[PDB]
Write an enzyme that holds these catalytic residues in place. Structure first.
Site, PDB file in Angstrom:
ATOM      1  N   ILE A 130       0.855  -1.174   0.000  1.00 44.71           N
ATOM      2  CA  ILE A 130       0.000   0.000   0.000  1.00 44.71           C
ATOM      3  C   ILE A 130       0.899   1.234   0.000  1.00 44.71           C
ATOM      4  O   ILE A 130       0.746   2.114  -0.851  1.00 44.71           O
ATOM      5  CB  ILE A 130      -1.007   0.013   1.182  1.00 44.71           C
ATOM      6  CG1 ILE A 130      -1.936  -1.208   1.141  1.00 44.71           C
ATOM      7  CG2 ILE A 130      -1.805   1.345   1.163  1.00 44.71           C
ATOM      8  CD1 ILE A 130      -2.836  -1.330   2.324  1.00 44.71           C
ATOM      9  N   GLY A 131       1.830   1.294   0.939  1.00 46.04           N
ATOM     10  CA  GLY A 131       2.671   2.466   1.108  1.00 46.04           C
ATOM     11  C   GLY A 131       3.392   2.476   2.434  1.00 46.04           C
ATOM     12  O   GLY A 131       3.349   1.497   3.179  1.00 46.04           O
ATOM     13  N   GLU A 132       4.066   3.583   2.730  1.00 41.84           N
ATOM     14  CA  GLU A 132       4.695   3.803   4.031  1.00 41.84           C
ATOM     15  C   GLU A 132       3.770   4.641   4.927  1.00 41.84           C
ATOM     16  O   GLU A 132       2.962   5.433   4.431  1.00 41.84           O
ATOM     17  CB  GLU A 132       6.037   4.538   3.863  1.00 41.84           C
ATOM     18  CG  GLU A 132       7.014   3.838   2.935  1.00 41.84           C
ATOM     19  CD  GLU A 132       7.509   2.496   3.438  1.00 41.84           C
ATOM     20  OE1 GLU A 132       7.243   1.473   2.768  1.00 41.84           O
ATOM     21  OE2 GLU A 132       8.164   2.469   4.505  1.00 41.84           O
ATOM     22  N   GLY A 133       3.911   4.450   6.235  1.00 39.62           N
ATOM     23  CA  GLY A 133       3.267   5.279   7.245  1.00 39.62           C
ATOM     24  C   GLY A 133       4.267   5.785   8.266  1.00 39.62           C
ATOM     25  O   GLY A 133       5.478   5.749   8.032  1.00 39.62           O
ATOM     26  N   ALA A 134       3.772   6.260   9.407  1.00 39.99           N
ATOM     27  CA  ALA A 134       4.636   6.777  10.463  1.00 39.99           C
ATOM     28  C   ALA A 134       5.617   5.703  10.977  1.00 39.99           C
ATOM     29  O   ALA A 134       6.780   6.014  11.214  1.00 39.99           O
ATOM     30  CB  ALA A 134       3.797   7.320  11.604  1.00 39.99           C
ATOM     31  N   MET A 167       6.640   0.069   6.729  1.00 34.42           N
ATOM     32  CA  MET A 167       5.909  -0.447   5.560  1.00 34.42           C
ATOM     33  C   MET A 167       4.524  -1.013   5.890  1.00 34.42           C
ATOM     34  O   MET A 167       4.369  -1.690   6.895  1.00 34.42           O
ATOM     35  CB  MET A 167       6.705  -1.548   4.859  1.00 34.42           C
ATOM     36  CG  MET A 167       5.986  -2.155   3.650  1.00 34.42           C
ATOM     37  SD  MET A 167       7.016  -3.244   2.639  1.00 34.42           S
ATOM     38  CE  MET A 167       8.211  -2.069   2.024  1.00 34.42           C
ATOM     39  N   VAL A 168       3.537  -0.765   5.000  1.00 32.87           N
ATOM     40  CA  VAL A 168       2.158  -1.224   5.163  1.00 32.87           C
ATOM     41  C   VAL A 168       1.718  -1.984   3.920  1.00 32.87           C
ATOM     42  O   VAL A 168       1.872  -1.470   2.815  1.00 32.87           O
ATOM     43  CB  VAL A 168       1.198  -0.033   5.437  1.00 32.87           C
ATOM     44  CG1 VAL A 168      -0.227  -0.529   5.667  1.00 32.87           C
ATOM     45  CG2 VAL A 168       1.691   0.806   6.605  1.00 32.87           C
ATOM     46  N   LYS A 227       0.810  -3.506   9.261  1.00 33.82           N
ATOM     47  CA  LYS A 227       1.947  -2.616   9.301  1.00 33.82           C
ATOM     48  C   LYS A 227       3.129  -3.299   9.999  1.00 33.82           C
ATOM     49  O   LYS A 227       2.936  -3.975  11.014  1.00 33.82           O
ATOM     50  CB  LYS A 227       1.580  -1.262   9.926  1.00 33.82           C
ATOM     51  CG  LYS A 227       1.378  -1.184  11.416  1.00 33.82           C
ATOM     52  CD  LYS A 227       1.103   0.277  11.813  1.00 33.82           C
ATOM     53  CE  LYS A 227       0.238   0.387  13.029  1.00 33.82           C
ATOM     54  NZ  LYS A 227       0.253   1.759  13.575  1.00 33.82           N
ATOM     55  N   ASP A 268      -2.880  13.781  18.597  1.00 39.68           N
ATOM     56  CA  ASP A 268      -2.447  13.994  17.223  1.00 39.68           C
ATOM     57  C   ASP A 268      -3.554  13.734  16.229  1.00 39.68           C
ATOM     58  O   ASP A 268      -3.358  13.115  15.196  1.00 39.68           O
ATOM     59  CB  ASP A 268      -1.219  13.132  16.927  1.00 39.68           C
ATOM     60  CG  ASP A 268      -0.417  13.587  15.713  1.00 39.68           C
ATOM     61  OD1 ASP A 268      -0.527  14.790  15.327  1.00 39.68           O
ATOM     62  OD2 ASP A 268       0.338  12.744  15.147  1.00 39.68           O
TER      63      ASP A 268
HETATM   64  C1  N3O Z   1      -3.461   5.663  11.813  1.00 40.02           C
HETATM   65  C2  N3O Z   1      -2.894   5.711  10.409  1.00 40.02           C
HETATM   66  C3  N3O Z   1      -3.127   4.422   9.644  1.00 40.02           C
HETATM   67  O1  N3O Z   1      -3.207   3.350  10.240  1.00 40.02           O
HETATM   68  N1  N3O Z   1      -3.237   4.519   8.301  1.00 40.02           N
HETATM   69  C4  N3O Z   1      -3.774   3.511   7.464  1.00 40.02           C
HETATM   70  C5  N3O Z   1      -3.590   3.464   6.082  1.00 40.02           C
HETATM   71  N2  N3O Z   1      -4.113   2.493   5.304  1.00 40.02           N
HETATM   72  C6  N3O Z   1      -4.825   1.576   5.963  1.00 40.02           C
HETATM   73  O2  N3O Z   1      -5.439   0.511   5.368  1.00 40.02           O
HETATM   74  N3  N3O Z   1      -6.094  -0.231   6.396  1.00 40.02           N
HETATM   75  C7  N3O Z   1      -5.844   0.404   7.509  1.00 40.02           C
HETATM   76  C8  N3O Z   1      -6.376  -0.092   8.811  1.00 40.02           C
HETATM   77  C9  N3O Z   1      -5.066   1.523   7.285  1.00 40.02           C
HETATM   78  C10 N3O Z   1      -4.528   2.520   8.075  1.00 40.02           C
END
Ligand code: N3O
Length: 346
Positions: free
Chosen positions: A21-25, A28-29, A44, A139
């Site tokens: 999907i992408g990167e988050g805080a 990798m996700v 994540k 936040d």
């Molecule tokens: C709190 C931020 C986060 O979890 N972003 C996020 C992005 N994409 C997603 O797809 N499924 C979920 C649960 C997320 C969360």
């Protein structure tokens, strides 16, 4: 073990068919098919065990999310990690897959007044539960609000959350702060550590304004510029509100500014529902003592179609960090994460 973009994304045989999907805080996700529940899920990957700050925030997120159970708060479905502390390097957190977040939605989609009203209701409904547990999210922002294909909304990322501590909220002027700049209440820059529930209501006010126009209301480019955006719309604080700021450096800063008049909400948001703007005004109050509380906000006429306190649950008990996580060494926090994640092992 499966790889994604040349990196180990090792989620056991339960989760297959990974899609980046992408990167988050945190890192990798990926989405993946959950072969038990027979649905795609979000996963994540976290690697926090060398740094005390990533450790602290990861532990905070896990302890809170496992304790909370609410329709408008993201749950943790599963946690994947090695069977022993010595072998544990990464932790995978499995959550409901959500179509989007409000950040992506606002970049691409105009919201109907009906969608704004429903989103705001769900944010406050979730926030009522969090505050009832004596927790501050700290936040809140569009990217921390997830939406599914039917517009159910869930608050996520409790990495900066704290137990409320109003008696220790005071600080000096220009005290550094961690949470996302555009959603910071004016008092953060003046005399507040962000230890009171009013901090979260300001962020919600900012989110409501952003839903009304698809643009952040106070896009400050640096610490003090954020306060000058806020004053540019609210106008100069009143004598009474100034008198509540006892700190002289903060007071005198405000007294040094030229007089600024309030920008009427109906000129900033000419298409907005008038009840939405009345509620917005009450959330974006300069003086945090005068700022509307979450339960009053739910009871506001704007939300009358949804308001039902019997269906706006609270937490069964206040939340407590047993140890002060702020000064725990790196090895102790890894042991704590290992223990907190134990219930998901076979
Ligand atoms: C709190 C931020 C986060 O979890 N972003 C996020 C992005 N994409 C997603 O797809 N499924 C979920 C649960 C997320 C969360």
């Amino acid at each position: 073990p499966e790889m994604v973009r040349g990196q180990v994304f090792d989620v056991g045989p339960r989760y297959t068919n990974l899609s980046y999907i992408g990167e988050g805080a945190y890192g990798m996700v990926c989405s993946a098919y959950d072969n038990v529940n027979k649905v795609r899920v979000a996963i994540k990957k976290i690697s926090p065990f060398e740094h005390q700050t990533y450790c602290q925030r990861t532990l905070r997120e896990i302890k809170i999310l496992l304790r909370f159970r609410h329709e408008n708060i993201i749950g943790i479905n599963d946690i994947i990690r090695a069977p022993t502390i010595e072998q544990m390097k990464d932790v995978y957190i499995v959550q409901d897959l959500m179509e989007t977040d409000l950040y992506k939605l606002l970049k691409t989609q105009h919201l109907s007044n009906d969608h704004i009203c429903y989103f705001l209701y769900q944010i406050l409904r979730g926030l009522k539960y969090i505050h009832s547990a004596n927790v501050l999210h700290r936040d809140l922002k569009p990217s921390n609000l997830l939406l599914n294909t039917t517009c159910d909304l869930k608050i996520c990322d409790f990495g900066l959350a704290r137990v409320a501590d109003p008696d220790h909220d005071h600080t000096g002027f220009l005290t550094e702060y961690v949470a996302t700049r555009w959603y910071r209440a004016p008092e953060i820059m003046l005399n507040s550590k962000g230890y009171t529930k009013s901090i979260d209501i300001w962020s919600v006010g900012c989110i409501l304004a952003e839903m009304l126009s698809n643009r952040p209301i106070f896009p400050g480019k640096h610490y003090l510029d954020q306060l000058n955006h806020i004053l540019g719309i609210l106008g100069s604080p009143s004598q009474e509100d100034l008198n509540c700021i006892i700190n002289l450096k903060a007071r005198n800063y405000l007294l040094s500014l030229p007089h600024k008049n309030k920008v009427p909400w109906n000129r900033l948001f000419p298409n907005a529902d008038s009840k939405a703007l009345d509620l917005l005004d009450k959330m974006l109050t300069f003086n945090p003592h005068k700022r509307i509380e979450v339960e009053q906000a739910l009871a506001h006429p704007y939300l009358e179609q949804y308001y039902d306190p019997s269906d706006e649950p609270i937490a069964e008990a206040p939340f407590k960090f047993d140890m002060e996580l702020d000064d725990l060494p790196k090895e102790k926090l890894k042991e704590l994460i290992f223990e907190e994640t134990a219930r998901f092992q076979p």
